[model samples]
Target chain A: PAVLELEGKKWRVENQENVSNLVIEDTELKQVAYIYKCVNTTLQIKGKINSITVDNCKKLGLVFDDVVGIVEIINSKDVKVQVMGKVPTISINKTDGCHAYLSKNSLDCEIVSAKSSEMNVLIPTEGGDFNEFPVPEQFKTLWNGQKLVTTVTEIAG
Target chain B: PAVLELEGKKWRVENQENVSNLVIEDTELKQVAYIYKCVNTTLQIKGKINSITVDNCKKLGLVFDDVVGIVEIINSKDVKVQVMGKVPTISINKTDGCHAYLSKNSLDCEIVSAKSSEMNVLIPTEGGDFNEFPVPEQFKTLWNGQKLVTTVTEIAG
Candidate 1:
């Protein structure tokens, strides 16, 4: 059947020429998977996402953009992002992490109650169009009123 | 000056004929404001946003889709929203609110630590293509595995 039952909810796998939108019923995703360009969706994963790019998502459970190995957000605000899991590297741009509690480019996995998912950051190449990417208004204090191209990795306790 | 100092960061008010991308520094947005079609940014506000529409944003602070009086996600996800003021009404689509803890169409102002920032949801018009608007996959269970047309109001304490 086009609609198969996995983890209780219904899912229509759109695996054709390209992985379009794989619509799944609301349930915890606990398997090795690859998802891309997911928008306005809720993702509760207990397993691992091989590779994923969550563009414009809300209340996201996790994300693994350019997933070298593994992955993570909130609310009714414009966009929210959280990083969980272990990967060789992760990237964040034009988004807020750590609930605006930390700097725009920083992460504190200690707040994460997920399993021992540890990771690190990779600094970006300097001298890009920093002005093209303005630091968000709420998190500007973390950047000291300046916009810079940088990526912060998740810290492990 | 091409760059105007707003909050703490420099914002080039692209206040052209169209307010397509009104980028501002991260700060507590208070007062009557109008924004539209923003992507990958944060908005932290202490006062009411008269009206706004955020599309494809990450780690956003808050938004107000309607102007009944006031306002309102993402990945950009570590539970990305913290409401700090009162919005008489709010609208959410293709996103998660309150960590997906509340129903898809629901919001809880009490979850917001911002002092006395409360809100409620309004009823959407009936007989619209609500089924076309699918509940996010992660919160599909909240709707009992069915993608039906419904609007859920926030529960105030």
Candidate 2:
């Protein structure tokens, strides 16, 4: 299951466990891609693709160029993504430790995350430097005798 | 299979998926516990235990008083631990996003981690405040022509 095939304008990479250094060098804007159950591997997309969805992967390094649509990351651990070009949106859920390196053009992109933790978005800076911002992991909840109110934890200092 | 049963000197919590709150009180230093395949659950140990190991859990909230030996976290995601007393060691492997809040007495505990990411250790300050120190997620490797040398990624700044 280490083969990449094109089907119905979509490319699928499935069960590519422990195989490193994969590439899709000739991607197109009309095509999309999906990666599932890949472990400890690095995959690169050299051209623009419509969208990409990765699921149930571990220790995956996804390096890609522009994405015309959105990128979806789900149920993964210790996975990172480097956007060499612009990606308009990202949806991350049930994931842990997602390190996203965004290009300058993708700085203002929207990321909708739920049930995720330790998500750090690294933005390229003025002097070609980078800074990290982490997603909130702690929250405080209070009960008003009828309903519950929840908010992110704030340091007292 | 959401049951807590004592088998020998070890307690087992298995298949407790989607349950919100769980607890084990009146623990002893000669006993141990194991949690498996729990999702979105919070378990608290009210007293000292010999050891604890949690595996294949998601979003688990572990609050414990103490551990005589160590705590092992394996293949978990977004799990947090709060130690109220003392734990000697923690072995985290194949885990993602582990947040550990150590008590003042447990400040010098040993943590050995591998294949893990997004680990944060929060230590209490002199004024009862706290600060976070994150685990190294990025690494740089070079081939010295004889062997592959790897080191943690360092910022240019």
Candidate 3:
């Protein structure tokens, strides 16, 4: 049985370990990809795709271009994603130590993280430096008579 | 003291009630705006800005062009935000009802919601329609002995 399947606009890369240089190229926006349970590997996806989900993997490096829907990271550890183009959304859930590198064109992308730790977003600057910002893990909550109030606990550069 | 202040590239609209047709035009990316405790009002921001925050507001309708940082909604109820351009991220916290409309150029925007209810996002489709999607509120969590695992409880079209 093959671990990689690229059939009918859906890609599945599952259960591969200690491998680098796995790539999917020239994909359209209608295509979707999934990378699961791969440990210590590097996978590159070229061109636009609808979505990409990486689940239960450790130390996986993913480089991709545009994604219209989302790039989802779930139950993964130490995963990295580099975006060369645009992606509407990125959802990170139940992961530890995830990093994202956003290109100039991808500066407008949003990241949604839940139950995650050590999440960082790197954005390119005009002077050719990638500034890293950590997502807030601690929150402050208050009850304002009628409803609840919440905010990030602390903010720093 | 005036409730609206435009000073040093910062705009604040606080404690306003029952107003419409408030507009800020031709703003640069360095400019930032904050709206607090506004009730039943319509506000417009034209051009790019660094960030915008809507806090402790109810029944507010906000229309903005672009945001480089984030649109933060905290302790708000029944708030609506329409984006005509790009915004990198949106964070909704402790909000009751929120609806976001995304433009074509802003398709890559990501929304992060915590302790929120009835959050929806609408994106313009190719067929001249705005498609709406609900943010997941419930999660299914399982402890895989060694670590904690969590996922969205339900998924539907």
Model 1 bad stretches (over 4 Å): A1-157, B1-41, B63-79, B96-157
Taken over the whole model, the C-alpha lDDT of each candidate is 0.27, 0.75, 0.78
Please report the candidate that would top TM-score against the real structure. 2
DockQ of model 3 vs. true complex = 0.02
lDDT tens per residue, model 1, A24-121? 33433333343233344434333333433333343333322222342232212233333333343233322333231122232221121111111112
Each candidate structure's TM-score, on Cα atoms with residue i matched to residue i, is 0.23, 0.51, 0.50
lDDT of 2 by residue, B76-112 (tens): 9988988989988776777898988777888767666
lDDT (10s digit) by residue, model 3, range B1-157: 2288787888988888888988987577798999999999899998888999999999999999889889999889999999988888778887878988888887667777765667777777787687767666444332232322344533244
Error of 2 at A125 (Å): 1.5
Quote the lDDT for B52 in model 2: 94
CAPRI class assigned to model 2: incorrect
> Model 3 in CAPRI terms: which quality?
incorrect
RMSD of 2: 12.5
In model 2, which runs have C-alpha deviations exceeding 4 angstroms? A144-147, A154-157, B1-157
Q: After superposition, how far is residue A140 of candidate 3 from its true place, in Å?
A: 19
The candidates, ranked best first by TM-score, are 2, 3, 1
